[PDB]
Symmetry: C2
Subunit: 615 residues, 2 copies
């Protein structure tokens, strides 16, 4: 049916082995929720838990909270002026309710942080999905392929701005990946192989897409009223501290952490990255040497020649997940005070690791085995000795790139394909619905961001080897598109509506991938079309400088596109300007007393002209 | 003595050949000045002119004007909030008075623009210098060499922010040019010639100086309350228009200009630039060929070997002034609606022309004559035929660079050195003081900006040839330092106090010069130390990538320097946050009625625990 005004739900698992302090913590949590003005209902949970609903009860405290939040946004420039001296979107009430649920006592709410606080029993605080909206969206989406602006607006109005930003980025990427597809089809059908024109077109498209997405995200931030949200610093509850100090200039009571300890912890990234590089490169070299050996020995010259590469691609997700788990553990150990800084560091680590695992094989095949033709010689001798008991065609990259995309894409498709083949006896349906709702996994969006960034990097720096690859990606994205729509619908719980300004450091990742692709496509074209080194360096010069010039030109052009957000902002500025304008409509002395008025000044001027032109 | 409250002075030259309409325009100007609330005094001018003083008389109109100005600044984010519903710096009153003097009738003031309006007799509207302040500043400065923050603050309080920004940039450049000097002295005394270490140090210093000046100008803009001033669009009075239209979204009454005509006018830059390149390159090649011929023929192998280069350097100021005059004429023809856009276009044209005239000779000597050893062959044959009636040492650049700096620097020093070797009989001293004040030239600051930018470019891309050159520049700057201090004191009239955000496009010019220097220093080092082309391209790769990496690292480091402006802004944010916080302190129904309170919720929770753990 529909919710009974329930705003947030607390799971609060209660085990029998720690009943006493669990009951004490439940009492403390109920008291802390009641002391801020939040109505509570305990109900019966499942799997030894006590789920409890909470909503806003006292309008005065809620009004104070929204006023404080809007004042904070005004301080950082999110809005124009102060709110009032004493309206709300659907996916905003949940935001302030979660704020008062988790924020400490010194800004109104009561800190019920599931980790920092003593309440170890609290582990999941979540809003509730709209059953009617979910059913309507599943019905409407069951016969739809693409996304429009209306869908993005609905996602904004329902699940905050971060999910809306992710969906807008996904739609823009899918719409811009079409030109890749047509260009690659034309190059594979007409241009031949390793075309410089295709590399130039791919670099131009990458620059255009990056700059257009920058402009589009700025436009969306201006239109959605979330411009400058990243300037707002959100305190991380899990931030451990050892010293409580004051600011020498303002007097912040700050839980300060010695920066030397954080620097020492960050220095552990270098040994970790070096060990990952060494191990993964050794595995890659072993696989490539075994592939070369079996190609030299072997009915299977073409198809049965990239089996090590296929196995490496198949095993790449497992190693990738392990490395992301290790990076997450390291980032948890690496203390951070603010949420945005911790998220940026985690994204940087994950991007570096995924870049490594997903591009080092292609880099070794393209740029390492041509100059360093003896690195795999000991491995070749070892394989020959084991079996007892060499040119390097550049085009090997192309086929390998195919075997690095289609197979993996096909495997993902196959996985999804394989699976299918008392309670008061008055509202118990709602209670059981919440019961399987709290068992859902949290909506994680960084994985899809990273996957699409890796796809963009593939298209940027390696689609020149196999132009059709982008096409495959597009098809995959289409299927993946559906896999995202239901993912937030029933496949995952409702995420907390968080205001965001952009996609984050993924923009910098995309820019770096664009530059590296502009270099790498030209390098591959020169290395495979033919060698003279000076030609390769001149090609790199031309590619990088053309990339920079095209970036500047595209920025200059897009600065004159007249986005709807900018014109809306300037119209609002006009309106407020008119509103404010209509709302508010001794000789030193006698030096200004010889003449005072109109006729006197006129006559002295006439006399001055007379005496000046009379002689 | 001191002024009698005079705020602005209008010269209003009156010739006898057009007495009638001059008198009519004088009457109209007096009426327009009186209708806004400005007290006027006509006096007796000199050289057939009618100088007139004007100051604020009615406080109500002035209050309305300052309120409107502060509202406009608030709209663009210069200040925090709206001013009031109904205080002023010394160099701010003059700004609003000039605004009401020149702005059209639809925003309070009366348009007395000396060019756009029919008043062709009005040609100079200027404020008055403070005689006491001028005398005190000359006394205090007569025994001082360098600049401090107090001098910059005084320049801000007296002559607006643009002059203050220029003086701050000059002081920062002089302070940062010291490290150039020591490094060049060490390289010339110890490192030898064309040291790669010196090139790396010069590139590092250039990056550090550029990023530090960016941070310093941001800090100054935040501290001076002029952040975001560039967002404010100032209408150019000289902007000719042919159509009056309305905005489709807001309704601006806009004097619109067809963009196709402006694009066609801008397209004239390509033929002009190409003709300048051709002519100047032909002259440079002729001079270099004649120098080579006289070096081959000739007591004067060393000293009398760069006479064509010395003559070209001596004649460079004349051609430079002619080309800047042509560029100014073209920019005047090239219509612009806003002041900032016209200024940016003029600065771009002047920078391109000065870059050409001041660097093409060195570029031809360093990078053109080595590969293109036959371009000057016909000129050499012509010189030989004229006289009748060939290796290329790279080090020729070094000496030439010396002859391209010292001589020119010496010539400038010599020029300055050469020159020395009724009126009511009550206040007539003030009147005659104004009389020679209106004859002064307007304070132009773009010339010094361009000269210092060219000096920075020299130090960036050509100081590696002669490391001592920077030292000379420093010395020159020191002398030039004095030549600037008095330049605004008595040598020029008081400029209009204009709020500015930064130095303008000179920042982009400095960044481009830094990048080009990072490339060119390495190219010169490789070409003169030795050739293999691939080595040169690898050196260019290393230099450019190291420049980019160092730029990123310096940006990252300077983002954690804690500028005083940022901490002042955050303290103000704290203060206003505290001020605002202290100033403002059917089952759907009975689902929330089974229990309501503290004891009821506690007891139902106790019973729930009992029934859950009882079975
Ligand atoms: C692999 C990278 C390991 C970097 C180890 C050094 C870690 C470090 O102290 O710099 C951090 C990031 O700086 C960097 O990204 C630069 C690292 C360059 C890698 C060499 C500061 O981070 P913050 O939170 O203070 O901002
Ligand atoms: C193989 C190596 C790949 C290096 C990847 C470098 C680019 C990483 C993608 C960029 C990123 O993750 O975040 C940025 C990290 O700061 C950086 O970029 C510095 C480079 C860190 C890598 C060392 C901060 O972005 P922000 O939006 O916070 O500004
Ligand atoms: C292959 C591995 C290379 C490791 C070196 C990575 C160095 C860190 C690069 C981190 C990079 O953060 O950001 C983008 C780099 O794009 C670039 O301009 C490339 C310049 C740095 C590359 C030099 C090596 C610039 O983004 P934007 O500032 O536009 O925002
Ligand atoms: C980004 C930074 C780019 C660095 C490019 C490195 C270029 C190194 C040039 C090495 C030049 C060299 O001595 O080896 C020549 C051929 O090897 C080569 O083709 C070197 C190819 C290396 C491929 C690197 C491209 C990856 C770019 C990402 C044969 O001897 P050469 O003909 O000189 O007599
Ligand atoms: C020499 C340059 C001649 C440029 C002739 C083209 C002039 C042109 O239409 O572009 C202007 C500047 O664009 C440019 O700077 C790019 C010119 C690139 C030069 C090729 C626009 O200027 P705006 O005021 O509209 O902004
Ligand atoms: C020999 C050639 C030298 C080309 C000089 C290019 C750099 C000129 C210095 C930069 C400049 O003058 O202003 C910029 C012009 O826009 C440009 O840069 C575009 C390049 C125009 C040159 C064609 C706008 O700066 P803004 O602060 O308004 O942003
Ligand atoms: C030798 C003559 C070259 C003519 C080409 C000039 C092209 C116009 C360059 C105009 C340039 O405007 O701006 C700076 C260029 O620095 C650069 O990144 C160099 C890249 C463009 C140079 C490619 C040629 C970047 O400033 P930033 O964006 O950091 O602010
Ligand atoms: C910025 C963009 C940089 C462009 C560099 C242009 C490199 C052109 C390489 C030309 C290579 C060439 O064929 O000439 C070789 C020597 O000539 C050369 O040393 C060319 C030197 C030209 C100097 C250009 C540097 C100015 C950089 C500002 C002799 O034949 P090679 O040895 O190849 O057999």
């Amino acid at each position: 049916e529909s919710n009974f005004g329930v705003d947030f739900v607390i799971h609060y698992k209660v085990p029998a082995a720690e009943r006493d302090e669990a009951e004490a913590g439940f009492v403390q949590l109920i008291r802390a929720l009641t002391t801020v003005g939040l109505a509570t209902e305990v109900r019966h949970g499942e799997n030894e838990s006590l789920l409890v609903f909470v909503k806003v009860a006292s309008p005065d405290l809620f009004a104070k909270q929204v006023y404080r939040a809007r004042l904070g946004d005004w301080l950082h420039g999110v809005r124009v002026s102060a709110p009032h001296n004493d309206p709300v979107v659907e996916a905003e009430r949940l935001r302030l309710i979660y704020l008062m649920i988790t924020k400490p006592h010194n800004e109104g709410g009561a800190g019920v942080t599931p980790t920092n606080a003593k309440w170890k029993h609290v582990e999941s605080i979540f809003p509730l999905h709209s059953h009617s909206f979910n059913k309507e969206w599943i019905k409407k989406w069951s016969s739809k392929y693409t996304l429009e602006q209306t869908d993005i607006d609905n996602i904004r109005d329902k699940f905050g701005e971060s999910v809306a930003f992710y969906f807008a980025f996904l739609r823009s990427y899918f719409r811009f990946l079409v030109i890749p597809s047509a260009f690659g089809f034309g190059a594979w059908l007409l241009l031949g192989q390793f075309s410089y024109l295709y590399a130039l077109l791919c670099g131009l498209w990458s620059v255009v897409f990056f700059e257009y997405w920058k402009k589009q995200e700025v436009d969306l931030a201006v239109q959605w009223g979330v411009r400058g949200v990243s300037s707002i610093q959100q305190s991380r509850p899990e931030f451990e501290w050892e010293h409580e100090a004051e600011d020498p200039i303002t007097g912040e009571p700050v839980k300060v952490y010695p920066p030397m300890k954080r620097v020492k912890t960050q220095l552990l990234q270098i040994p970790f990255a070096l060990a990952c590089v060494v191990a993964l490169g050794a595995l890659i070299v072993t696989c490539n040497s075994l592939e070369v050996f079996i190609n030299e020995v072997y009915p299977g010259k073409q198809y049965l020649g990239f089996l090590p590469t296929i196995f490496l691609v198949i095993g790449t997700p497992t190693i990738s997940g392990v490395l992301m788990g290790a990076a997450e553990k390291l980032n948890a150990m690496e203390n951070y005070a603010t949420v945005d800084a911790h998220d940026a560091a985690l994204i940087q680590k994950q991007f570096v690791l995924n870049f490594m695992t997903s591009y080092m094989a292609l880099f070794f095949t393209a740029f390492v085995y041509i100059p360093f033709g003896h690195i795999l010689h000991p491995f070749l001798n070892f394989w020959r000795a084991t079996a007892q008991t060499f040119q390097i065609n550049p085009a090997r990259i192309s086929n390998q790139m195919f075997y690095f995309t289609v197979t993996a894409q096909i495997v993902n498709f196959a996985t999804e394909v394989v699976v299918p083949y008392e309670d008061h006896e008055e509202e118990a349906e709602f209670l059981q619905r919440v019961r399987e709702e709290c068992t859902l996994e949290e909506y994680d969006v960084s994985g899809d961001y990273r996957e699409m960034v890796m796809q963009f990097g593939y298209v940027a720096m390696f689609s020149v080897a196999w132009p059709l690859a982008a096409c495959c990606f597009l098809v995959n994205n289409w299927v993946e598109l559906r896999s995202d729509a239901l993912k937030i619908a029933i496949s995952s719980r409702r995420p907390i509506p968080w205001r965001t300004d952009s996609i984050g450091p993924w923009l910098t990742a995309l820019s770096f991938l664009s530059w590296l692709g502009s270099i790498t496509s030209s390098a591959i074209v020169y290395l495979c079309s033919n060698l003279k080194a000076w030609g390769l360096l001149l090609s790199i010069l031309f590619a990088e400088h053309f990339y920079l010039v095209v970036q500047l030109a595209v920025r200059f052009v897009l600065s004159k596109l007249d986005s709807p957000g900018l014109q809306k902002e300037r119209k609002e500025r006009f309106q407020t300007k008119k509103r404010l304008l209509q709302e508010n409509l001794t000789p030193e002395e006698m030096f200004w007393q010889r003449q005072r008025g109109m006729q006197e000044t006129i006559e002295i001027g006439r006399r001055m002209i007379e005496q000046q032109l009379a002689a």
